[PDB]
Amino acid sequence: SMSVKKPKRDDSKDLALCSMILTEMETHEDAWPFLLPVNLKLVPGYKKVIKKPMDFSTIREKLSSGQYPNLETFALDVRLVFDNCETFNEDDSDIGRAGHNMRKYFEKKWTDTFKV
Ligand SMILES: CC(=O)N1CCc2[nH]c3ccc(Cl)cc3c2C1
């Protein structure tokens, strides 16, 4: 509260570390569904159903331009990619599997980097 803060957890390297995680995300073999925004003119249903589209390129641009106030808003956008993928894709599809795989890969990197 006013004049009462817990000790400052060091956040100076967060930007760089989130960038590194994102690079690892971008270069994963199963990232292909997520690299660019879904083409809303070419994918029937997507626009109406998915209220907040997100993709890796959009996250990279937001990151590079200071649009994440903190590491948690970054993780919210990453998770949004996978949440959308689950909303739109059957688990037993290539893309549904890719999303589960990428979520798993992300969350380990996330824990190991910021919670281990
Ligand atoms: C991620 C997802 O729900 N999408 C919607 C379905 C879909 N199909 C694709 C084929 C090729 C590429 Cl590169 C991406 C896609 C997507 C993206």
Structural domain spans, the chain: 1-116
The answer to whether 63 touches 22, Cβ cutoff 8 Å, is yes
The answer to whether 88 touches 34, Cβ cutoff 8 Å, is no
Backbone angles phi, psi at 101, to 5 degrees: -60, -45
Q: Which of 93, 95, 97 to mutate for ligand 1's pocket (most ligand atoms within 8 Å of CB)?
A: 95
Backbone angles phi, psi at 50, to 5 degrees: -100, 105
Angle between helices 94-114 and 14-27 (to 10 degrees): 150
Resolution of the model in angstroms = 1.9
> Which method resolved this structure?
X-ray
45 φψ region: left (φ > 0), alpha (ψ -120 to 50), beta (else):
left
110 CA distance to ligand 1 middle (Å): 25
Cα 2 to Cα 87: distance, rounded to the nearest angstrom: 42
Q: Is 37 helix (H, G, I), strand (E, B) or coil?
A: coil
The answer to whether 71 touches 111, Cβ cutoff 8 Å, is no
Nearest ligand 1 atom, CA 46: 5
33 token code pair: 């569904």
Does CATH number 1.20.920.10 belong to domain 1-116? Answer: yes
What distances in angstroms separate CA 56 from CA 5, 11, 43, 67, 101, one per listed residue? 35, 23, 18, 14, 15
Cα 17 to Cα 109: distance, rounded to the nearest angstrom: 10
